Design an enzyme around this catalytic site. Structure first.
Site, mmCIF file in Angstrom:
data_model
loop_
_atom_site.group_PDB
_atom_site.id
_atom_site.type_symbol
_atom_site.label_atom_id
_atom_site.label_comp_id
_atom_site.label_asym_id
_atom_site.label_seq_id
_atom_site.Cartn_x
_atom_site.Cartn_y
_atom_site.Cartn_z
ATOM 1 N N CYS A 107 -9.739 11.222 14.602
ATOM 2 C CA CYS A 107 -8.342 10.738 14.232
ATOM 3 C C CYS A 107 -7.550 10.267 15.337
ATOM 4 N N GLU B 178 12.375 5.318 -5.874
ATOM 5 C CA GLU B 178 13.063 5.642 -7.012
ATOM 6 C C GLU B 178 12.525 5.040 -8.159
ATOM 7 N N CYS C 152 -7.254 7.735 12.454
ATOM 8 C CA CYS C 152 -5.837 7.551 12.057
ATOM 9 C C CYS C 152 -4.820 7.090 13.043
ATOM 10 N N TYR D 61 -12.187 2.479 2.471
ATOM 11 C CA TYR D 61 -10.901 2.454 3.427
ATOM 12 C C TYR D 61 -11.112 2.095 4.641
ATOM 13 N N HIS E 66 18.990 4.889 -4.211
ATOM 14 C CA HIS E 66 18.874 3.275 -4.229
ATOM 15 C C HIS E 66 19.612 2.835 -2.987
ATOM 16 N N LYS F 78 -5.657 3.397 14.195
ATOM 17 C CA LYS F 78 -5.895 2.499 12.818
ATOM 18 C C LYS F 78 -4.226 2.109 12.406
ATOM 19 N N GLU G 177 -8.904 -1.265 5.592
ATOM 20 C CA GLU G 177 -7.860 -1.070 6.738
ATOM 21 C C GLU G 177 -8.316 -1.889 7.826
HETATM 22 C C1 LIG Z 1 -11.473 4.528 10.772
HETATM 23 C C2 LIG Z 1 -10.766 6.061 10.089
HETATM 24 C C3 LIG Z 1 -9.494 6.127 10.018
HETATM 25 C C4 LIG Z 1 -9.075 7.164 9.391
HETATM 26 N N1 LIG Z 1 -7.755 7.409 9.117
HETATM 27 C C5 LIG Z 1 -7.176 8.536 8.507
HETATM 28 C C6 LIG Z 1 -5.978 8.840 8.088
HETATM 29 O O1 LIG Z 1 -5.155 7.857 8.058
HETATM 30 N N2 LIG Z 1 -5.359 9.867 7.429
HETATM 31 C C7 LIG Z 1 -6.300 11.054 7.636
HETATM 32 O O2 LIG Z 1 -5.896 12.033 6.944
HETATM 33 N N3 LIG Z 1 -7.683 10.948 7.848
HETATM 34 C C8 LIG Z 1 -8.091 9.588 8.598
HETATM 35 N N4 LIG Z 1 -9.513 9.401 8.853
HETATM 36 C C9 LIG Z 1 -10.212 10.874 8.756
HETATM 37 C C10 LIG Z 1 -9.737 11.808 9.808
HETATM 38 O O3 LIG Z 1 -10.084 11.310 11.118
HETATM 39 C C11 LIG Z 1 -10.959 12.851 9.813
HETATM 40 O O4 LIG Z 1 -10.862 13.260 8.354
HETATM 41 C C12 LIG Z 1 -10.856 14.049 10.629
HETATM 42 O O5 LIG Z 1 -10.535 13.637 12.039
HETATM 43 C C13 LIG Z 1 -12.084 15.002 10.681
HETATM 44 O O6 LIG Z 1 -11.564 16.171 11.773
HETATM 45 P P1 LIG Z 1 -12.702 17.161 12.125
HETATM 46 O O7 LIG Z 1 -12.089 18.153 12.865
HETATM 47 O O8 LIG Z 1 -13.773 17.527 10.901
HETATM 48 O O9 LIG Z 1 -14.054 16.114 12.896
HETATM 49 P P2 LIG Z 1 -13.444 15.209 14.186
HETATM 50 O O10 LIG Z 1 -12.056 14.972 14.513
HETATM 51 O O11 LIG Z 1 -14.520 14.052 13.931
HETATM 52 O O12 LIG Z 1 -13.760 16.345 15.452
HETATM 53 C C14 LIG Z 1 -15.498 16.528 15.522
HETATM 54 C C15 LIG Z 1 -15.517 16.555 17.166
HETATM 55 O O13 LIG Z 1 -16.769 17.464 17.675
HETATM 56 C C16 LIG Z 1 -17.396 16.792 18.489
HETATM 57 N N5 LIG Z 1 -18.982 17.398 18.353
HETATM 58 C C17 LIG Z 1 -19.873 16.692 17.298
HETATM 59 N N6 LIG Z 1 -21.037 17.396 17.610
HETATM 60 C C18 LIG Z 1 -20.700 18.468 18.663
HETATM 61 C C19 LIG Z 1 -21.535 19.327 19.297
HETATM 62 N N7 LIG Z 1 -22.465 19.716 18.736
HETATM 63 N N8 LIG Z 1 -20.907 20.192 20.454
HETATM 64 C C20 LIG Z 1 -19.685 19.858 20.761
HETATM 65 N N9 LIG Z 1 -18.861 18.747 20.176
HETATM 66 C C21 LIG Z 1 -19.559 18.110 18.999
HETATM 67 C C22 LIG Z 1 -17.337 15.121 17.870
HETATM 68 O O14 LIG Z 1 -17.654 14.349 18.830
HETATM 69 C C23 LIG Z 1 -15.916 15.299 17.633
HETATM 70 O O15 LIG Z 1 -15.026 15.238 19.081
HETATM 71 C C24 LIG Z 1 -9.921 8.412 9.305
HETATM 72 C C25 LIG Z 1 -11.380 8.451 9.969
HETATM 73 C C26 LIG Z 1 -11.795 7.081 10.211
HETATM 74 C C27 LIG Z 1 -13.047 6.963 10.771
HETATM 75 C C1 LIG Z 2 29.642 -0.607 0.697
HETATM 76 C C2 LIG Z 2 28.968 0.204 -0.200
HETATM 77 C C3 LIG Z 2 27.628 0.477 -0.136
HETATM 78 C C4 LIG Z 2 26.930 1.272 -1.172
HETATM 79 N N1 LIG Z 2 25.597 1.886 -1.080
HETATM 80 C C5 LIG Z 2 25.152 2.454 -2.189
HETATM 81 C C6 LIG Z 2 23.874 2.801 -1.963
HETATM 82 O O1 LIG Z 2 23.173 2.389 -0.950
HETATM 83 N N2 LIG Z 2 23.136 3.704 -3.038
HETATM 84 C C7 LIG Z 2 24.133 4.136 -3.997
HETATM 85 O O2 LIG Z 2 23.454 4.843 -4.936
HETATM 86 N N3 LIG Z 2 25.543 3.785 -4.063
HETATM 87 C C8 LIG Z 2 25.834 2.931 -3.024
HETATM 88 N N4 LIG Z 2 27.207 2.614 -3.290
HETATM 89 C C9 LIG Z 2 28.142 2.993 -4.344
HETATM 90 C C10 LIG Z 2 27.813 2.523 -5.855
HETATM 91 O O3 LIG Z 2 27.956 1.049 -5.450
HETATM 92 C C11 LIG Z 2 28.805 2.837 -6.789
HETATM 93 O O4 LIG Z 2 28.519 4.180 -6.772
HETATM 94 C C12 LIG Z 2 28.463 2.103 -8.208
HETATM 95 O O5 LIG Z 2 28.294 1.004 -8.133
HETATM 96 C C13 LIG Z 2 29.498 2.625 -9.308
HETATM 97 O O6 LIG Z 2 29.299 2.157 -10.319
HETATM 98 P P1 LIG Z 2 30.279 1.934 -11.543
HETATM 99 O O7 LIG Z 2 29.627 1.635 -12.587
HETATM 100 O O8 LIG Z 2 31.116 3.160 -11.544
HETATM 101 O O9 LIG Z 2 31.390 1.079 -10.763
HETATM 102 P P2 LIG Z 2 31.345 -0.661 -10.327
HETATM 103 O O10 LIG Z 2 29.902 -0.771 -10.128
HETATM 104 O O11 LIG Z 2 32.472 -0.688 -9.337
HETATM 105 O O12 LIG Z 2 31.824 -1.332 -11.828
HETATM 106 C C14 LIG Z 2 32.902 -1.482 -12.328
HETATM 107 C C15 LIG Z 2 33.534 -2.857 -12.426
HETATM 108 O O13 LIG Z 2 34.175 -2.855 -13.635
HETATM 109 C C16 LIG Z 2 35.424 -3.722 -13.236
HETATM 110 N N5 LIG Z 2 36.796 -3.593 -13.831
HETATM 111 C C17 LIG Z 2 37.616 -2.681 -13.263
HETATM 112 N N6 LIG Z 2 38.655 -2.784 -13.981
HETATM 113 C C18 LIG Z 2 38.451 -3.460 -15.173
HETATM 114 C C19 LIG Z 2 39.285 -3.700 -16.224
HETATM 115 N N7 LIG Z 2 40.247 -2.958 -16.561
HETATM 116 N N8 LIG Z 2 38.540 -4.536 -17.184
HETATM 117 C C20 LIG Z 2 37.370 -5.257 -17.075
HETATM 118 N N9 LIG Z 2 36.509 -4.823 -16.128
HETATM 119 C C21 LIG Z 2 37.111 -3.891 -14.954
HETATM 120 C C22 LIG Z 2 35.241 -3.790 -11.659
HETATM 121 O O14 LIG Z 2 35.796 -4.826 -11.006
HETATM 122 C C23 LIG Z 2 33.654 -3.748 -11.668
HETATM 123 O O15 LIG Z 2 33.273 -5.005 -11.877
HETATM 124 C C24 LIG Z 2 27.883 1.874 -2.284
HETATM 125 C C25 LIG Z 2 29.184 1.420 -2.254
HETATM 126 C C26 LIG Z 2 29.968 0.707 -1.199
HETATM 127 C C27 LIG Z 2 31.398 0.327 -1.405
#
Ligand SMILES: Cc1cc2nc3c(=O)[nH]c(=O)nc-3n(C[C@H](O)[C@H](O)[C@H](O)COP(=O)(O)OP(=O)(O)OC[C@H]3O[C@@H](n4cnc5c(N)ncnc54)[C@H](O)[C@@H]3O)c2cc1C
Ligand SMILES: Cc1cc2nc3c(=O)[nH]c(=O)nc-3n(C[C@H](O)[C@H](O)[C@H](O)COP(=O)(O)OP(=O)(O)OC[C@H]3O[C@@H](n4cnc5c(N)ncnc54)[C@H](O)[C@@H]3O)c2cc1C
Ligand SMILES: NC(=O)C1=CN([C@@H]2O[C@H](COP(=O)(O)OP(=O)(O)OC[C@H]3O[C@@H](n4cnc5c(N)ncnc54)[C@H](OP(=O)(O)O)[C@@H]3O)[C@@H](O)[C@H]2O)C=CC1
Ligand SMILES: NC(=O)C1=CN([C@@H]2O[C@H](COP(=O)(O)OP(=O)(O)OC[C@H]3O[C@@H](n4cnc5c(N)ncnc54)[C@H](OP(=O)(O)O)[C@@H]3O)[C@@H](O)[C@H]2O)C=CC1
Ligand SMILES: *SC[C@H](NC(=O)CC[C@@H](N)C(=O)O)C(=O)NCC(=O)O
Ligand SMILES: *SC[C@H](NC(=O)CC[C@@H](N)C(=O)O)C(=O)NCC(=O)O
Ligand SMILES: N[C@@H](CCC(=O)N[C@@H](CS)C(=O)NCC(=O)O)C(=O)O
Ligand SMILES: N[C@@H](CCC(=O)N[C@@H](CS)C(=O)NCC(=O)O)C(=O)O
Ligand SMILES: [Ca+2]
Ligand SMILES: [Ca+2]
Lengths: 587, 587
Positions: free
Chosen positions: B149, B571, B154, B291, B566, B157, B295
């Site tokens: 790893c 979500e 890992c 993989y 959102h 990679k 990858e």
């Molecule tokens: C390209 C690639 C990408 C991967 N990506 C991911 C990932 O994204 N996420 C994930 O969870 N896993 C990933 N894996 C898997 C992960 O690397 C292994 O599952 C993990 O490292 C295994 O751990 P280990 O302790 O069993 O063996 P190792 O980490 O291989 O350790 C064994 C060690 O013992 C040594 N050894 C061997 N024989 C002896 C000996 N007799 N005496 C002393 N030392 C010895 C070896 O040389 C090595 O240093 C990936 C693997 C590869 C090949």
């Molecule tokens: C800058 C900003 C960023 C935000 N970012 C997020 C976020 O990342 N994630 C998240 O979950 N929430 C976010 N929010 C909150 C989210 O936008 C609100 O919680 C949500 O839009 C409210 O929904 P609503 O249906 O109650 O009101 P609104 O979406 O405000 O709808 C009310 C509508 O009715 C209209 N209206 C008002 N009075 C009348 C009337 N009497 N007759 C007819 N129409 C009328 C209004 O003009 C409007 O069009 C953010 C808010 C702001 C201001």
């Protein structure tokens, strides 16, 4: 409770079919309803544990206990032969169209909540109208269908956040072996805004098309509720008329506040204006300190802007304050300037926005610090991000009988019902609820399903995860550390924490000991996870999956038995050990 | 089972203190042990539901039922007065050092599993040795402490994956308003490799320092088990000697396979070589399709390489095959060429690697397709990614009495025990276990805790989440759709699915209807989530949180009640509706 359930369902549903999945008579009715393109709810009684008792109860409404049984607006309409009789006589269309009101549902507001409720109600055959109107900002900014999120919120904010993130992708690229000349790279604000607005445009159009496709009537009009069932509408041509509806959903959302100082409304802007601003803001002051303030300051800075945030007291009031300090410290370390314990007294204009060359004007901001020092500085753009407020009427609203709270929000039951019984409120105007888009959406959909499809499921407003899309993102689910201590006492709270470094930050030469996460846990309740917090890239993607586990009542041991995915930032949650009580460093 | 627990703990632990948290005599012993820097396990009996019964059982070993009770290697050593007596007489150091063997633990292999086990055992006072040796690849590639790893897996990679991702960040930047000239940007392979190897270097050094700081003896030496308690070691100076240990952990990992064709070993390379390759690979053939193959092909392509993957039969055998087809289709659409149903017959050299200018050679690859067409093409670099194999001995191993399976992996109990009772195996050589880094790490830590700290917790190998870090990432937790259908029958399986588009891809003009996710669910078991699958950016960050919920037994309803964040890709899991059985399009 199966008697009351059926009564509520029959009385509320617009068009509903009580059915069984193995009944050829139920199928014959479904075929008829589909051929005549009559949309309806369907409840399959053989799929419910209390279905037999429901069959018995149906006779209270129909005098029969067999399936199928079709209802329209509280009224038993027929068994299968009867429905077929209406079909062959060409009476069925008239029958299903019959109503005391113009609509089964009027939705006032066409944002996240309103559109969700409206589209979902139409699916069960409810005759639905959605009213949306966008009152212009003081400088005249207006926009199309979809609400705050689509036009002036989550969508453009996250896209500008991405534009900001790409700035750092450019810096990181070189350490990853990419050969580019960064001294010759610059950002064009208006190009970004064009791309952002082009996507928003497709969303506006998309929702209109969706309302069309679901046969919802869309009216670009301002609605006012004048009695339980009467909505007065004003079109663009300024024409006033009245439409009637059985159920009303208030989904009118909020608008940004301005402080009550000279020059604020005349010269400042808000998030409402920022996302379609045709000039670059230039040297900017953001006034306020919650997530809109910090998200906007943050992407502006990453785009190369000279940015200052004026902070009355604390950052992100209501959020965990250790996490909030960390969010701010990161932004401060990366160029964002903070005017601390400072309030604005006045904005004065020095230069008008250049409307032909799309360039900003110039403003003078006078203010004062708590110690007596005057604040006086020039900014090209002043952004107010000091909260949002609902736009309904303490008096007018109470005169139709809909009760509002101190802050002007609608007081509701746990099923979104107002003090007027056919009138509901969803999204940001619903008092006490988390003000987020998916919450408004879930509330609207669940509400439409209860009203028109006989569902029972309430929206669960507890432990709703959030993400603040600051330059370094902050995701949270559940309680802050201080709120949990306040609730259960210090001796019952254990906090597991750790710093971490994204693998990507290693070759890129970024900070050690800045990314951070913690689990706030209750000792008495088997180390129940009460709050989750992560400061790091992709925090929202990290946080989301954990919100399911937390809703299921995850304990620390659940986290511990779970194996990490390597290499990710998220896997750090699976091997946390260091506690705050032990005093050992999270580094 | 509290009798057997105590017997196993007393017999296995190196240095252990049975204690109570409110006992001033227990504190006095802890103070003594800390002042003398004697590391040990501590079990606080007042923290355990069966602690009183443990106190009674302790008399089977000590003749007393009071706390504290100190044990060394199976032997009661004293109550508090006794321990203080040894302290004041300066006998205590001798006592705790006394052992039949040179070490309480010998770990053979210093990778993810070995280092984890070794460091964790030292924490409880076990005298620990870790042996690591890296046999050179056929072309002479070797590396330092940390295992597959850290050095050839890992870590490098994911960093090369990031370098690849940054390529597309450069393309996306322009649509986000960044002004750059991409026709003048190029990638430098060796610069990237230098940055990657520099970080790996700090990891090598970091682990050495960690072993030092935990007082683990590190020997850069090849170990062979010659009897239950005797490990023969060969140093670099080729000196042979023998060390003895109570417990032995085999953590020797695997190495890449080569196909048995002419020129493979002489001219091809593997992942072992690729991550420190001092020349750029240039036009590359990857042979294999799981993989590692995908990858490596993927980041090579994103760096601008001309890449071909030779596929014997299917992609990602053992993974969900609908997801595997989607992973491949994305790579094919983005420039990676696939030679389908094709196998290599021979590699012939056309040009030697230029060792002074760090440029690749040239190779001729001859092969054949299933239809009879010959494959014949020139490549600068040929990469074999056709599996990995353990490097232990069917005969030698059986002669010490450690049983291996058909594939040469060690057959173990659910507590990692081999057929030799003091000998354990963890990580990739443990037959039947998921071959991942955090699994090896969890196994090692849990094993060390059982042996030396009296823990009981087994490693849970079920529902371990993975991510394939292909150009578009693929995260999964639990069962493939086909394996779930095979287990429970088609009629008991419901699949909820959806396409999605990251918000970031909108302005950037990337694919609709390519990102994809599904939940495989069991109808009978309350729509229990049996498998989760997501194809999209940051899939590993997305997947991780859901693995906790799945281990807790998440149902679809749990997903449904959870509110989304959102805007995120994650979500989409919270609002899935479309089922495969309904035939409705996921678009
Ligand atoms: C390209 C690639 C990408 C991967 N990506 C991911 C990932 O994204 N996420 C994930 O969870 N896993 C990933 N894996 C898997 C992960 O690397 C292994 O599952 C993990 O490292 C295994 O751990 P280990 O302790 O069993 O063996 P190792 O980490 O291989 O350790 C064994 C060690 O013992 C040594 N050894 C061997 N024989 C002896 C000996 N007799 N005496 C002393 N030392 C010895 C070896 O040389 C090595 O240093 C990936 C693997 C590869 C090949
Ligand atoms: C800058 C900003 C960023 C935000 N970012 C997020 C976020 O990342 N994630 C998240 O979950 N929430 C976010 N929010 C909150 C989210 O936008 C609100 O919680 C949500 O839009 C409210 O929904 P609503 O249906 O109650 O009101 P609104 O979406 O405000 O709808 C009310 C509508 O009715 C209209 N209206 C008002 N009075 C009348 C009337 N009497 N007759 C007819 N129409 C009328 C209004 O003009 C409007 O069009 C953010 C808010 C702001 C201001
Ligand atoms: N999910 C997401 O990513 C996001 C959601 N949102 C939504 O938007 C809503 C409101 O947004 P926002 O504008 O940030 O408002 P907030 O209600 O969140 O906070 C108001 C901020 O402005 C400050 N403030 C208030 N009055 C003044 C004053 N008169 N002078 C100076 N400063 C003042 C407050 O500081 P003080 O503590 O001193 O009172 C506080 O920092 C939130 O409730 C949230 O639901 C917004 C952005 C992102
Ligand atoms: N978590 C992660 O992100 C990663 C983990 N890993 C670990 O590495 C291990 C092995 O890696 P890998 O090298 O991908 O091996 P795998 O065991 O995963 O698969 C071997 C691949 O090579 C093909 N193959 C085998 N023999 C031949 C042959 N003689 N001629 C042509 N093709 C052949 C197989 O195709 P066929 O179906 O026809 O047999 C298959 O595609 C995995 O088990 C995994 O634990 C590796 C990479 C990433
Ligand atoms: S809540 C009672 C009703 N309000 C609305 O329908 C929305 C008002 C809001 N859009 C606004 O004021 O801008 C209301 O004001 N009643 C009017 C009446 O004459 O009773
Ligand atoms: S499993 C028995 C033992 N094997 C090892 O200790 C590791 C062997 C492996 N590193 C290799 O072969 O490269 C073994 O081979 N026994 C030797 C003996 O003389 O009994
Ligand atoms: N006259 C009725 C026929 C009702 C009928 O025969 N339905 C059967 C099901 S196929 C029924 O409701 N009885 C069985 C039960 O108790 O569900 C109609 O036209 O709808
Ligand atoms: N002679 C013992 C003293 C043992 C003793 O007084 N310990 C108390 C706790 S402070 C005890 O084990 N008895 C109470 C119990 O049952 O736990 C020693 O030196 O360790
Ligand atoms: Ca774990
Ligand atoms: Ca949901």
């Amino acid at each position: 409770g199966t008697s009351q359930w059926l009564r509520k369902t029959v009385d509320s549903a617009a068009v509903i079919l009580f059915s069984k999945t193995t009944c050829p008579y139920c199928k014959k009715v479904k075929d008829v309803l589909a051929e005549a393109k009559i949309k309806h709810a369907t409840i399959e009684l053989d799929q419910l544990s209390n279905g037999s008792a429901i069959q018995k109860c149906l006779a209270s409404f129909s005098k029969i206990e067999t399936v199928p049984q079709m209802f329209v607006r509280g009224k038993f309409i027929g068994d299968s032969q009867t429905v077929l009789k209406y079909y062959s006589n060409d009476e069925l269309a008239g029958i299903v169209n019959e109503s005391k009101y113009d609509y089964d549902l009027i939705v006032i507001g066409g944002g996240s909540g309103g559109l969700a409720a409206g589209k979902e109600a139409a699916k069960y055959g409810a005759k639905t109208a959605v009213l949306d109107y966008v009152e212009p900002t003081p400088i005249g900014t207006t926009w199309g269908l979809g609400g705050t999120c689509v036009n002036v919120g989550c969508i453009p904010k996250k896209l500008m956040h991405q534009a900001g993130l790409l700035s750092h992708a450019l810096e990181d690229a070189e350490h990853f072996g990419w050969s580019l000349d960064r001294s010759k790279i610059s950002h064009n604000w208006s190009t970004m805004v064009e791309g952002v607005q082009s996507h928003i445009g497709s969303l506006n159009w998309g929702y209109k098309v969706a309302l069309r496709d679901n046969q919802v009537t869309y009216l670009n009009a301002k609605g006012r509720l004048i009695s339980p069932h009467e909505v007065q509408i004003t079109d663009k041509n300024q024409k006033v008329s009245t439409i009637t509806g059985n159920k009303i959903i208030l989904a009118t959302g909020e608008r940004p506040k301005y402080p009550e100082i000279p020059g604020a409304v005349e010269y400042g802007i808000t998030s409402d204006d920022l996302f379609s601003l045709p000039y670059f803001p230039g040297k900017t002051l953001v006034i306020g300190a919650s997530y809109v303030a910090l998200e906007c300051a943050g992407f502006l800075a990453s785009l190369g802007g000279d940015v200052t945030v004026m902070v009355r007291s604390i950052l992100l009031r209501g959020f965990d304050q250790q996490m909030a300090e960390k969010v701010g410290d990161y932004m401060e370390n990366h160029g964002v300037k903070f005017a601390k314990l400072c309030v604005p007294d006045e904005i004065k204009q020095l230069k008008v926005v250049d409307t032909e060359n799309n360039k900003p004007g110039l403003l003078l901001v006078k203010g004062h610090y708590t110690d007596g020092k005057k604040f006086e500085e020039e900014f090209e753009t002043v952004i107010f991000a000091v909260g949002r407020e609902p736009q309904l009427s303490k008096v007018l609203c109470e005169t139709v009988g809909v009760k509002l709270d101190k802050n002007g929000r609608v007081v509701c039951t746990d099923d979104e019902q107002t003090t007027v019984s056919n009138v509901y409120a969803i999204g940001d105007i619903n008092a006490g609820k988390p003000q987020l888009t998916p919450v408004a959406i879930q509330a609207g959909r669940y509400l439409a399903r209860r009203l028109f499809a006989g569902a029972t499921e309430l929206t669960d407003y507890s432990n709703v995860a959030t993400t603040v899309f600051t330059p370094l993102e902050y995701g949270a689910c559940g309680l802050s550390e201080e709120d949990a201590i306040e609730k259960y006492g210090d001796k019952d709270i254990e906090v597991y924490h750790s710093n971490f470094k994204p693998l990507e930050w290693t070759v890129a030469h970024r900070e050690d000991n800045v990314c951070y996460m913690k689990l706030v846990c209750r000792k008495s309740d088997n180390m129940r996870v009460l709050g989750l917090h992560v400061l790091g890239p992709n925090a929202g993607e990290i946080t989301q999956g954990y919100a399911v586990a937390i809703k299921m009542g995850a304990t620390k041991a659940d986290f511990d038995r779970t194996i990490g995915i390597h290499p990710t930032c998220s896997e750090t949650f699976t091997t946390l050990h260091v506690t705050k009580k032990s005093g050992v460093s999270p580094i």
